[PDB]
Each structure stands twice: as structure tokens, then as C-alpha cells.
Amino acid sequence: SMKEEIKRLAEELKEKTKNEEIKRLAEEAAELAERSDDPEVLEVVKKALEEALKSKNEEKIELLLLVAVLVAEAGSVDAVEEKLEIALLALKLAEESKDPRIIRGALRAAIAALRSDDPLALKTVKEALERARASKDERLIRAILAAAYAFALLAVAGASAERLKEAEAIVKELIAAAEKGASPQELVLLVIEMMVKGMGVTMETHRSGNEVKVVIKGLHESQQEVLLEAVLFAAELMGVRVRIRFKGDTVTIVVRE
Ligand SMILES: [Cl-]
């Protein structure tokens, strides 16, 4: 049957991985598929699991399993059309590009968007992925994806709705600046600014020579981890070397032009 094949695919996937979250999604997928009545759903789960088994990219596998869980938990592919379209966009961009940074940015932005279940984050990431696919500027694509990931991460972390609304103005500012040739270092500064705004903390910037020092005060340990994930991911995507210092509850992020 369809379900027995799906359970074997999930069983194989969950033993092959060392990633505990992929293991949990594989099991959730198998259980939801077991209870599924909709053959359209079962087809999508099977094709997601088969594709995951053929992949060596763990972010791609996470995205595919998230798709399978979403469709199977919903009962229909139509109920999750927007999330499905975001995942397809990311999967298309990931096979259309050879840059490992673009591949990783597309899949991670889509994963975070889907996990957020946040209307504004879903729409912003969908548009970012469309904009990246229409662009031939790989530098701009990498900046678009870094902004989209940081934004979706704020949503995943439960930023207040009003702080996320204001963070979207910084997404727009970053993308506009990138299109006008702004430096990778200034685009990283904008990702820092977006995170500081999204988390309700404060920042001061100090520039001397070719070094820019951003001092961020009032970060809790939970906020520290979210801000540094977005900022280090952005620095990896845009090829920026970043250094970090910590004293008390103060984080200092150093960028060199
Ligand atoms: Cl096999």
C-alpha cells in the first residue's frame, strides 16, 4: 500500500540521519501519513520522503520533511498552498544555483518561514524568493536571502507583532541598498539593526578607520542566540568576517571594511 511504503521510507530516513530534528520530523510524517485518508496527501509525503532519501543536503531534507508534515497534518494540499509554494520556490532556487551559499539561504529562509506560521513572514519570504529567482545578481540574491532569513527568524522567535512590522522596513531598506551597490559590510550592519529592532534592545555604532563596532545592550541569553544566528548566517552568506566580544549583558560585533 501507499502507507506501508511511506512508513518504510520514513523508517529508512530516520535511521540514516544523525540529526535529531530530522529524526523527529520523519516519525511525525509517518504517523500523520498513517492516519491520512487523502491520496493527494499521501502522494506528496511519498515523493517528499523519496526525494529526501536521494539528497545529501540536510537542509533540503529538513525542508522536504516539513512539507510532508504540513500537508499530512492539514489533510489536504490545498489547505497549505502558501507554505507549499514557498517550499517549491526555495527548492527551485536551490537547484537553479550552484553557489552553496544561495542554496543554503533559500532552504533556511523557507524552513524558518514555514516554522513561523506568521502571515507577514510567509509573504515576505515568498516575495524575497521570487525576487531572488528573477535576479541574475548573485550578490543581491545572497543579500535578499540573508535579510529574509533574519526576518523569518524574528518571527520564529516570537517577536512582538509591532516589532516585526517595523523590522520589515529594514528588510526593504537592506534590499534597496543592496540593489544600489552597498557594501557587504553595510548590509551586515543592516541585519544587525533589523535584529536589534525585532528584539527590542538597543545599539550604538562606533566607526574608526575601516572598523565598525556595534555595541548591543540588554540582550538576554535567549535573545543573544537568535541575534547571533541571524548575524553570523548573514556574514557567511555575504562573505563578511565578523568578530564578537561579550562583557556582562553587552555584545559587541566588529566588522572591517
Ligand atoms: Cl535502498
Numbering used by the authors: 1 to 257
From the paper:
To investigate the mechanism of facilitated dissociation, we focused on AS1, the design with the tightest effector binding (Kd,H:E ≈ 10 pM). The unbound structures show an open hydrophobic cleft in the new designed state X poised to bind the effector, and the effector-bound structures show that binding the effector causes the two switch domains to register-shift into the designed state Y. Starting from AS0, we constructed a new state X by shifting the two domains from their state Y positions relative to each other (by one heptad along the helix of domain 1 that contacts domain 2), building a new loop between the domains, and optimizing single sequences that could adopt both this new state X and the original effector-bound state Y. This approach maintains the open cleft in state X by introducing minimal rotation from state Y and simplifies the multi-state sequence-design challenge by minimizing the local structural differences between the two states. Transition between conformational states occurs by a register shift throughout which the cleft could remain open and bind the effector.
We set out to design protein systems that undergo facilitated dissociation. We use a switchable target binder (host) and a flexible effector that can rapidly bind to and switch the target–host complex to induce a large steric clash with the target, forming a strained excited ternary complex. We show here that by explicitly considering excited intermediate states when designing coupled protein systems, a broad range of facilitated dissociation systems can be designed.
